[PDB]
mmCIF file of all heavy atoms in Angstrom:
data_model
loop_
_atom_site.group_PDB
_atom_site.id
_atom_site.type_symbol
_atom_site.label_atom_id
_atom_site.label_comp_id
_atom_site.label_asym_id
_atom_site.label_seq_id
_atom_site.Cartn_x
_atom_site.Cartn_y
_atom_site.Cartn_z
ATOM 1 N N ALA O 1 0.834 -1.186 -0.002
ATOM 2 C CA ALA O 1 -0.009 0.011 0.004
ATOM 3 C C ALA O 1 0.887 1.238 -0.001
ATOM 4 O O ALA O 1 1.997 1.245 0.514
ATOM 5 C CB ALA O 1 -0.980 -0.002 1.207
ATOM 6 N N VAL O 2 0.343 2.315 -0.529
ATOM 7 C CA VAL O 2 1.043 3.580 -0.755
ATOM 8 C C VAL O 2 0.068 4.700 -0.435
ATOM 9 O O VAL O 2 -0.956 4.840 -1.104
ATOM 10 C CB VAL O 2 1.540 3.676 -2.200
ATOM 11 C CG1 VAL O 2 2.322 4.963 -2.385
ATOM 12 C CG2 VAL O 2 2.415 2.479 -2.514
ATOM 13 N N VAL O 3 0.396 5.557 0.539
ATOM 14 C CA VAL O 3 -0.394 6.765 0.812
ATOM 15 C C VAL O 3 0.224 7.929 0.047
ATOM 16 O O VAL O 3 1.464 8.103 0.108
ATOM 17 C CB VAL O 3 -0.399 7.078 2.309
ATOM 18 C CG1 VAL O 3 -1.025 8.499 2.537
ATOM 19 C CG2 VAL O 3 -1.159 5.985 3.085
ATOM 20 N N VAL O 4 -0.582 8.715 -0.637
ATOM 21 C CA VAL O 4 -0.132 9.877 -1.395
ATOM 22 C C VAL O 4 -0.887 11.105 -0.948
ATOM 23 O O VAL O 4 -2.029 11.017 -0.490
ATOM 24 C CB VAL O 4 -0.243 9.711 -2.925
ATOM 25 C CG1 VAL O 4 0.641 8.556 -3.413
ATOM 26 C CG2 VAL O 4 -1.698 9.378 -3.338
ATOM 27 N N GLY O 5 -0.238 12.287 -1.068
ATOM 28 C CA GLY O 5 -0.915 13.495 -0.681
ATOM 29 C C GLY O 5 -0.214 14.707 -1.290
ATOM 30 O O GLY O 5 0.839 14.591 -1.944
ATOM 31 N N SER O 6 -0.820 15.873 -1.082
ATOM 32 C CA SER O 6 -0.279 17.085 -1.603
ATOM 33 C C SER O 6 0.894 17.537 -0.744
ATOM 34 O O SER O 6 1.146 17.003 0.330
ATOM 35 C CB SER O 6 -1.385 18.161 -1.561
ATOM 36 O OG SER O 6 -1.625 18.419 -0.193
ATOM 37 N N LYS O 7 1.619 18.533 -1.180
ATOM 38 C CA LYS O 7 2.788 19.134 -0.483
ATOM 39 C C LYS O 7 2.288 19.598 0.881
ATOM 40 O O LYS O 7 2.906 19.300 1.827
ATOM 41 C CB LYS O 7 3.422 20.242 -1.299
ATOM 42 C CG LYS O 7 4.580 20.945 -0.622
ATOM 43 C CD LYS O 7 5.960 20.526 -1.130
ATOM 44 C CE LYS O 7 7.077 20.663 -0.086
ATOM 45 N NZ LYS O 7 7.765 19.369 0.161
ATOM 46 N N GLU O 8 1.163 20.314 0.913
ATOM 47 C CA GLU O 8 0.671 20.791 2.193
ATOM 48 C C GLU O 8 0.305 19.656 3.134
ATOM 49 O O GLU O 8 0.532 19.740 4.348
ATOM 50 C CB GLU O 8 -0.588 21.701 1.977
ATOM 51 C CG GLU O 8 -0.353 23.016 1.274
ATOM 52 C CD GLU O 8 -0.114 22.871 -0.233
ATOM 53 O OE1 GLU O 8 -0.556 21.855 -0.867
ATOM 54 O OE2 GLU O 8 0.537 23.755 -0.785
ATOM 55 N N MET O 9 -0.303 18.586 2.600
ATOM 56 C CA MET O 9 -0.685 17.411 3.410
ATOM 57 C C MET O 9 0.551 16.699 4.027
ATOM 58 O O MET O 9 0.498 16.299 5.167
ATOM 59 C CB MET O 9 -1.516 16.449 2.570
ATOM 60 C CG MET O 9 -1.974 15.244 3.362
ATOM 61 S SD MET O 9 -3.055 15.718 4.728
ATOM 62 C CE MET O 9 -4.389 16.469 3.784
ATOM 63 N N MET O 10 1.649 16.582 3.246
ATOM 64 C CA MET O 10 2.883 16.055 3.822
ATOM 65 C C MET O 10 3.278 16.868 5.060
ATOM 66 O O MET O 10 3.676 16.324 6.092
ATOM 67 C CB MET O 10 4.015 16.071 2.801
ATOM 68 C CG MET O 10 3.826 15.260 1.547
ATOM 69 S SD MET O 10 3.547 13.514 1.861
ATOM 70 C CE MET O 10 1.752 13.390 1.617
ATOM 71 N N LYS O 11 3.283 18.191 4.922
ATOM 72 C CA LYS O 11 3.681 19.014 6.052
ATOM 73 C C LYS O 11 2.693 18.856 7.221
ATOM 74 O O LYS O 11 3.099 18.746 8.380
ATOM 75 C CB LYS O 11 3.784 20.488 5.614
ATOM 76 C CG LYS O 11 4.886 20.646 4.535
ATOM 77 C CD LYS O 11 4.898 22.005 3.864
ATOM 78 C CE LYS O 11 5.962 22.077 2.746
ATOM 79 N NZ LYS O 11 7.348 21.965 3.299
ATOM 80 N N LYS O 12 1.422 18.811 6.907
ATOM 81 C CA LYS O 12 0.328 18.673 7.911
ATOM 82 C C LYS O 12 0.553 17.379 8.687
ATOM 83 O O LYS O 12 0.304 17.361 9.881
ATOM 84 C CB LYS O 12 -1.026 18.695 7.218
ATOM 85 C CG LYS O 12 -2.167 19.284 8.017
ATOM 86 C CD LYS O 12 -3.347 18.330 8.107
ATOM 87 C CE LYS O 12 -4.630 18.973 7.662
ATOM 88 N NZ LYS O 12 -5.500 19.315 8.833
ATOM 89 N N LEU O 13 1.056 16.335 8.012
ATOM 90 C CA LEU O 13 1.243 15.062 8.620
ATOM 91 C C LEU O 13 2.640 14.843 9.197
ATOM 92 O O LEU O 13 2.918 13.770 9.736
ATOM 93 C CB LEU O 13 0.993 13.933 7.619
ATOM 94 C CG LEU O 13 -0.424 13.719 7.096
ATOM 95 C CD1 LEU O 13 -0.504 12.763 5.925
ATOM 96 C CD2 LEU O 13 -1.330 13.213 8.216
ATOM 97 N N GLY O 14 3.533 15.824 9.025
ATOM 98 C CA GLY O 14 4.887 15.715 9.565
ATOM 99 C C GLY O 14 5.697 14.621 8.862
ATOM 100 O O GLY O 14 6.494 13.921 9.512
ATOM 101 N N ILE O 15 5.524 14.475 7.554
ATOM 102 C CA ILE O 15 6.292 13.432 6.828
ATOM 103 C C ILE O 15 7.705 13.906 6.610
ATOM 104 O O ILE O 15 7.971 14.982 6.023
ATOM 105 C CB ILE O 15 5.630 13.140 5.469
ATOM 106 C CG1 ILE O 15 4.166 12.751 5.683
ATOM 107 C CG2 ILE O 15 6.423 12.017 4.756
ATOM 108 C CD1 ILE O 15 3.922 11.497 6.562
ATOM 109 N N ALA O 16 8.682 13.099 7.095
ATOM 110 C CA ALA O 16 10.058 13.529 7.082
ATOM 111 C C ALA O 16 10.735 13.352 5.719
ATOM 112 O O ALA O 16 11.628 14.117 5.385
ATOM 113 C CB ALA O 16 10.890 12.822 8.139
ATOM 114 N N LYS O 17 10.374 12.317 4.986
ATOM 115 C CA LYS O 17 11.025 11.981 3.718
ATOM 116 C C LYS O 17 10.004 11.744 2.612
ATOM 117 O O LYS O 17 9.946 10.662 2.000
ATOM 118 C CB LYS O 17 11.927 10.746 3.891
ATOM 119 C CG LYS O 17 13.172 10.969 4.729
ATOM 120 C CD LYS O 17 14.015 9.739 4.816
ATOM 121 C CE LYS O 17 15.461 10.050 5.272
ATOM 122 N NZ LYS O 17 16.141 8.829 5.698
ATOM 123 N N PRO O 18 9.173 12.744 2.320
ATOM 124 C CA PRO O 18 8.216 12.620 1.215
ATOM 125 C C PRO O 18 8.890 12.321 -0.089
ATOM 126 O O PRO O 18 9.854 13.031 -0.500
ATOM 127 C CB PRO O 18 7.490 13.951 1.191
ATOM 128 C CG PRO O 18 8.416 14.896 1.838
ATOM 129 C CD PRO O 18 9.176 14.101 2.883
ATOM 130 N N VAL O 19 8.358 11.358 -0.815
ATOM 131 C CA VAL O 19 8.863 10.943 -2.096
ATOM 132 C C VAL O 19 7.984 11.553 -3.160
ATOM 133 O O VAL O 19 6.768 11.323 -3.175
ATOM 134 C CB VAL O 19 8.963 9.414 -2.198
ATOM 135 C CG1 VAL O 19 9.195 8.914 -3.640
ATOM 136 C CG2 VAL O 19 10.096 8.909 -1.249
ATOM 137 N N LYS O 20 8.620 12.279 -4.079
ATOM 138 C CA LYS O 20 7.881 13.023 -5.094
ATOM 139 C C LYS O 20 7.571 12.109 -6.271
ATOM 140 O O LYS O 20 8.479 11.397 -6.714
ATOM 141 C CB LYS O 20 8.675 14.217 -5.583
ATOM 142 C CG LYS O 20 7.956 15.013 -6.683
ATOM 143 C CD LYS O 20 8.820 16.138 -7.269
ATOM 144 C CE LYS O 20 8.087 16.841 -8.375
ATOM 145 N NZ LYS O 20 8.848 17.945 -9.006
ATOM 146 N N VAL O 21 6.356 12.149 -6.741
ATOM 147 C CA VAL O 21 6.017 11.455 -7.960
ATOM 148 C C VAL O 21 6.451 12.343 -9.131
ATOM 149 O O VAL O 21 5.892 13.412 -9.360
ATOM 150 C CB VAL O 21 4.519 11.141 -8.057
ATOM 151 C CG1 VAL O 21 4.234 10.397 -9.402
ATOM 152 C CG2 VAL O 21 4.085 10.303 -6.878
ATOM 153 N N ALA O 22 7.547 11.923 -9.818
ATOM 154 C CA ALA O 22 8.037 12.714 -10.921
ATOM 155 C C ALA O 22 7.261 12.418 -12.229
ATOM 156 O O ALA O 22 7.261 13.232 -13.120
ATOM 157 C CB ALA O 22 9.527 12.456 -11.170
ATOM 158 N N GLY O 23 6.703 11.253 -12.306
ATOM 159 C CA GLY O 23 5.845 10.903 -13.451
ATOM 160 C C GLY O 23 5.202 9.593 -13.260
ATOM 161 O O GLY O 23 5.617 8.754 -12.445
ATOM 162 N N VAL O 24 4.153 9.350 -14.023
ATOM 163 C CA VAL O 24 3.474 8.060 -13.991
ATOM 164 C C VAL O 24 2.688 7.979 -15.273
ATOM 165 O O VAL O 24 2.077 8.935 -15.693
ATOM 166 C CB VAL O 24 2.555 7.926 -12.765
ATOM 167 C CG1 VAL O 24 1.550 9.012 -12.678
ATOM 168 C CG2 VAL O 24 1.878 6.566 -12.814
ATOM 169 N N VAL O 25 2.705 6.782 -15.872
ATOM 170 C CA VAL O 25 2.169 6.626 -17.215
ATOM 171 C C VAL O 25 1.425 5.291 -17.280
ATOM 172 O O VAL O 25 1.984 4.260 -16.814
ATOM 173 C CB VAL O 25 3.237 6.644 -18.329
ATOM 174 C CG1 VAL O 25 2.603 6.300 -19.666
ATOM 175 C CG2 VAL O 25 3.975 7.989 -18.501
ATOM 176 N N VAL O 26 0.266 5.268 -17.869
ATOM 177 C CA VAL O 26 -0.535 4.076 -18.136
ATOM 178 C C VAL O 26 -0.751 4.009 -19.676
ATOM 179 O O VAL O 26 -1.163 5.003 -20.251
ATOM 180 C CB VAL O 26 -1.891 4.144 -17.439
ATOM 181 C CG1 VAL O 26 -2.835 3.051 -17.929
ATOM 182 C CG2 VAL O 26 -1.745 4.024 -15.912
ATOM 183 N N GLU O 27 -0.527 2.838 -20.261
ATOM 184 C CA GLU O 27 -0.849 2.612 -21.648
ATOM 185 C C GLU O 27 -1.603 1.261 -21.785
ATOM 186 O O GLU O 27 -1.537 0.425 -20.910
ATOM 187 C CB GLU O 27 0.409 2.558 -22.585
ATOM 188 C CG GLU O 27 1.165 3.904 -22.629
ATOM 189 C CD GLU O 27 2.288 4.048 -23.666
ATOM 190 O OE1 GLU O 27 2.539 3.064 -24.408
ATOM 191 O OE2 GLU O 27 2.846 5.166 -23.719
ATOM 192 N N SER O 28 -2.284 1.112 -22.903
ATOM 193 C CA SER O 28 -2.780 -0.185 -23.364
ATOM 194 C C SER O 28 -1.891 -0.653 -24.493
ATOM 195 O O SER O 28 -1.284 0.105 -25.203
ATOM 196 C CB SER O 28 -4.275 -0.078 -23.776
ATOM 197 O OG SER O 28 -4.474 0.836 -24.836
ATOM 198 N N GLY O 29 -1.794 -1.980 -24.671
ATOM 199 C CA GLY O 29 -0.933 -2.563 -25.676
ATOM 200 C C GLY O 29 -1.527 -2.634 -27.046
ATOM 201 O O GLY O 29 -2.691 -3.054 -27.263
ATOM 202 N N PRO O 30 -0.737 -2.223 -28.039
ATOM 203 C CA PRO O 30 -1.140 -2.394 -29.432
ATOM 204 C C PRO O 30 -1.564 -3.803 -29.743
ATOM 205 O O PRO O 30 -0.922 -4.770 -29.279
ATOM 206 C CB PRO O 30 0.140 -1.975 -30.212
ATOM 207 C CG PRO O 30 0.806 -1.013 -29.299
ATOM 208 C CD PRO O 30 0.610 -1.627 -27.947
ATOM 209 N N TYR O 31 -2.619 -3.935 -30.526
ATOM 210 C CA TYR O 31 -3.184 -5.232 -30.925
ATOM 211 C C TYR O 31 -3.089 -5.390 -32.428
ATOM 212 O O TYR O 31 -3.475 -4.492 -33.221
ATOM 213 C CB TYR O 31 -4.649 -5.307 -30.478
ATOM 214 C CG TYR O 31 -5.365 -6.517 -31.129
ATOM 215 C CD1 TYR O 31 -5.174 -7.814 -30.662
ATOM 216 C CD2 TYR O 31 -6.154 -6.342 -32.245
ATOM 217 C CE1 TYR O 31 -5.821 -8.931 -31.302
ATOM 218 C CE2 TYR O 31 -6.826 -7.448 -32.886
ATOM 219 C CZ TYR O 31 -6.622 -8.740 -32.427
ATOM 220 O OH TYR O 31 -7.225 -9.818 -33.042
ATOM 221 N N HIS O 32 -2.548 -6.526 -32.888
ATOM 222 C CA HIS O 32 -2.582 -6.894 -34.284
ATOM 223 C C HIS O 32 -2.148 -8.320 -34.406
ATOM 224 O O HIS O 32 -1.545 -8.872 -33.465
ATOM 225 C CB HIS O 32 -1.705 -5.989 -35.136
ATOM 226 C CG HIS O 32 -0.269 -6.027 -34.670
ATOM 227 N ND1 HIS O 32 0.584 -7.065 -35.007
ATOM 228 C CD2 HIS O 32 0.400 -5.187 -33.899
ATOM 229 C CE1 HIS O 32 1.745 -6.835 -34.439
ATOM 230 N NE2 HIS O 32 1.664 -5.716 -33.729
ATOM 231 N N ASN O 33 -2.356 -8.914 -35.576
ATOM 232 C CA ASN O 33 -1.930 -10.317 -35.802
ATOM 233 C C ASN O 33 -0.790 -10.411 -36.778
ATOM 234 O O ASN O 33 -0.694 -11.393 -37.517
ATOM 235 C CB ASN O 33 -3.152 -11.104 -36.246
ATOM 236 C CG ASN O 33 -4.125 -11.281 -35.172
ATOM 237 O OD1 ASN O 33 -3.793 -11.764 -34.067
ATOM 238 N ND2 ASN O 33 -5.355 -10.873 -35.411
ATOM 239 N N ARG O 34 0.050 -9.415 -36.822
ATOM 240 C CA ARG O 34 1.201 -9.377 -37.696
ATOM 241 C C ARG O 34 2.425 -9.945 -37.007
ATOM 242 O O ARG O 34 2.428 -10.153 -35.832
ATOM 243 C CB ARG O 34 1.453 -7.921 -38.101
ATOM 244 C CG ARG O 34 0.245 -7.227 -38.840
ATOM 245 C CD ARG O 34 0.578 -5.835 -39.459
ATOM 246 N NE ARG O 34 0.905 -4.997 -38.354
ATOM 247 C CZ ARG O 34 0.052 -4.151 -37.751
ATOM 248 N NH1 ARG O 34 -1.204 -3.968 -38.183
ATOM 249 N NH2 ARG O 34 0.496 -3.495 -36.681
ATOM 250 N N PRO O 35 3.475 -10.232 -37.722
ATOM 251 C CA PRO O 35 4.647 -10.866 -37.061
ATOM 252 C C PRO O 35 5.540 -9.882 -36.298
ATOM 253 O O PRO O 35 6.622 -9.481 -36.780
ATOM 254 C CB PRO O 35 5.366 -11.517 -38.240
ATOM 255 C CG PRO O 35 4.299 -11.525 -39.474
ATOM 256 C CD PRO O 35 3.529 -10.258 -39.211
ATOM 257 N N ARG O 36 5.102 -9.508 -35.140
ATOM 258 C CA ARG O 36 5.920 -8.558 -34.325
ATOM 259 C C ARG O 36 7.177 -9.257 -33.821
ATOM 260 O O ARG O 36 7.161 -10.431 -33.598
ATOM 261 C CB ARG O 36 5.198 -7.959 -33.118
ATOM 262 C CG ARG O 36 4.393 -8.962 -32.302
ATOM 263 C CD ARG O 36 4.324 -8.519 -30.839
ATOM 264 N NE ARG O 36 3.464 -7.384 -30.536
ATOM 265 C CZ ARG O 36 2.186 -7.325 -30.692
ATOM 266 N NH1 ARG O 36 1.539 -8.362 -31.197
ATOM 267 N NH2 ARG O 36 1.495 -6.240 -30.390
ATOM 268 N N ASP O 37 8.216 -8.469 -33.614
ATOM 269 C CA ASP O 37 9.469 -8.901 -32.998
ATOM 270 C C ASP O 37 9.213 -9.050 -31.501
ATOM 271 O O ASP O 37 9.176 -8.013 -30.809
ATOM 272 C CB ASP O 37 10.536 -7.894 -33.259
ATOM 273 C CG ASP O 37 11.875 -8.165 -32.564
ATOM 274 O OD1 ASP O 37 12.040 -9.238 -31.956
ATOM 275 O OD2 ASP O 37 12.764 -7.315 -32.666
ATOM 276 N N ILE O 38 9.081 -10.250 -31.027
ATOM 277 C CA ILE O 38 8.778 -10.424 -29.607
ATOM 278 C C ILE O 38 10.029 -10.280 -28.755
ATOM 279 O O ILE O 38 9.944 -10.424 -27.522
ATOM 280 C CB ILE O 38 8.068 -11.763 -29.334
ATOM 281 C CG1 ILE O 38 9.073 -12.952 -29.467
ATOM 282 C CG2 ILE O 38 6.878 -11.945 -30.264
ATOM 283 C CD1 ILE O 38 8.373 -14.331 -29.220
ATOM 284 N N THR O 39 11.205 -10.028 -29.321
ATOM 285 C CA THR O 39 12.318 -9.672 -28.529
ATOM 286 C C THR O 39 12.344 -8.181 -28.190
ATOM 287 O O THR O 39 13.120 -7.749 -27.342
ATOM 288 C CB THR O 39 13.680 -10.078 -29.159
ATOM 289 O OG1 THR O 39 13.955 -9.279 -30.305
ATOM 290 C CG2 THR O 39 13.630 -11.575 -29.537
ATOM 291 N N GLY O 40 11.534 -7.390 -28.926
ATOM 292 C CA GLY O 40 11.161 -6.078 -28.485
ATOM 293 C C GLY O 40 9.888 -6.120 -27.663
ATOM 294 O O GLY O 40 9.417 -7.206 -27.280
ATOM 295 N N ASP O 41 9.298 -4.933 -27.368
ATOM 296 C CA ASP O 41 8.144 -4.904 -26.470
ATOM 297 C C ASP O 41 7.476 -3.542 -26.726
ATOM 298 O O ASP O 41 7.977 -2.515 -26.254
ATOM 299 C CB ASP O 41 8.555 -5.080 -25.020
ATOM 300 C CG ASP O 41 7.433 -5.413 -24.114
ATOM 301 O OD1 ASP O 41 6.630 -4.476 -23.734
ATOM 302 O OD2 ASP O 41 7.335 -6.616 -23.739
ATOM 303 N N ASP O 42 6.475 -3.542 -27.617
ATOM 304 C CA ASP O 42 6.012 -2.236 -28.110
ATOM 305 C C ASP O 42 5.599 -1.330 -26.961
ATOM 306 O O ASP O 42 6.052 -0.200 -26.833
ATOM 307 C CB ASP O 42 4.873 -2.375 -29.151
ATOM 308 C CG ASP O 42 3.711 -3.420 -28.794
ATOM 309 O OD1 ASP O 42 3.528 -3.802 -27.627
ATOM 310 O OD2 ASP O 42 2.992 -3.836 -29.753
ATOM 311 N N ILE O 43 4.775 -1.838 -26.030
ATOM 312 C CA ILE O 43 4.233 -0.989 -25.001
ATOM 313 C C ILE O 43 5.295 -0.626 -23.960
ATOM 314 O O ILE O 43 5.202 0.461 -23.426
ATOM 315 C CB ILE O 43 2.982 -1.684 -24.401
ATOM 316 C CG1 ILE O 43 2.374 -0.783 -23.290
ATOM 317 C CG2 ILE O 43 3.218 -3.149 -23.956
ATOM 318 C CD1 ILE O 43 1.096 -1.417 -22.803
ATOM 319 N N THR O 44 6.234 -1.492 -23.620
ATOM 320 C CA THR O 44 7.241 -1.090 -22.637
ATOM 321 C C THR O 44 8.129 0.014 -23.240
ATOM 322 O O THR O 44 8.486 0.948 -22.545
ATOM 323 C CB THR O 44 8.058 -2.256 -22.177
ATOM 324 O OG1 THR O 44 7.241 -3.153 -21.406
ATOM 325 C CG2 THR O 44 9.171 -1.836 -21.244
ATOM 326 N N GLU O 45 8.426 -0.080 -24.521
ATOM 327 C CA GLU O 45 9.194 0.933 -25.174
ATOM 328 C C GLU O 45 8.485 2.287 -25.149
ATOM 329 O O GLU O 45 9.079 3.324 -24.835
ATOM 330 C CB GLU O 45 9.520 0.532 -26.633
ATOM 331 C CG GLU O 45 10.317 -0.780 -26.713
ATOM 332 C CD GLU O 45 10.564 -1.304 -28.154
ATOM 333 O OE1 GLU O 45 10.619 -0.508 -29.074
ATOM 334 O OE2 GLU O 45 10.752 -2.515 -28.322
ATOM 335 N N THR O 46 7.208 2.283 -25.490
ATOM 336 C CA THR O 46 6.513 3.573 -25.630
ATOM 337 C C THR O 46 6.181 4.131 -24.242
ATOM 338 O O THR O 46 6.265 5.349 -24.042
ATOM 339 C CB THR O 46 5.251 3.476 -26.498
ATOM 340 O OG1 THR O 46 4.433 2.453 -25.974
ATOM 341 C CG2 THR O 46 5.615 3.227 -27.977
ATOM 342 N N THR O 47 5.794 3.271 -23.306
ATOM 343 C CA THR O 47 5.487 3.749 -21.956
ATOM 344 C C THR O 47 6.746 4.335 -21.313
ATOM 345 O O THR O 47 6.669 5.381 -20.695
ATOM 346 C CB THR O 47 4.908 2.598 -21.092
ATOM 347 O OG1 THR O 47 3.714 2.097 -21.642
ATOM 348 C CG2 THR O 47 4.536 3.042 -19.650
#
């Protein structure tokens, strides 16, 4: 589990070592029935 909050909420709670979310990304994977290179990984590359 992970609790997240605003900058003000960290201070309000006395959090000593708040970890900043620098980014977060969600994708869905491309779908097709063509001969993709499975040693690559389309969605991990783009995400």
Side-chain angles (χ1 to χ4, degrees):
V2 182
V3 170
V4 297
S6 67
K7 177 102 208 122
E8 292 74 24
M9 182 63 61
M10 298 302 102
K11 298 169 183 295
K12 211 235 234 255
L13 292 171
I15 306 299
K17 290 182 163 164
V19 166
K20 177 185 178 180
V21 180
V24 57
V25 174
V26 168
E27 297 189 359
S28 60
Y31 167 78
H32 57 80
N33 290 306
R34 301 191 295 265
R36 43 151 72 66
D37 175 8
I38 73 180
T39 71
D41 197 282
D42 44 19
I43 180 175
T44 292
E45 300 175 27
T46 54
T47 299

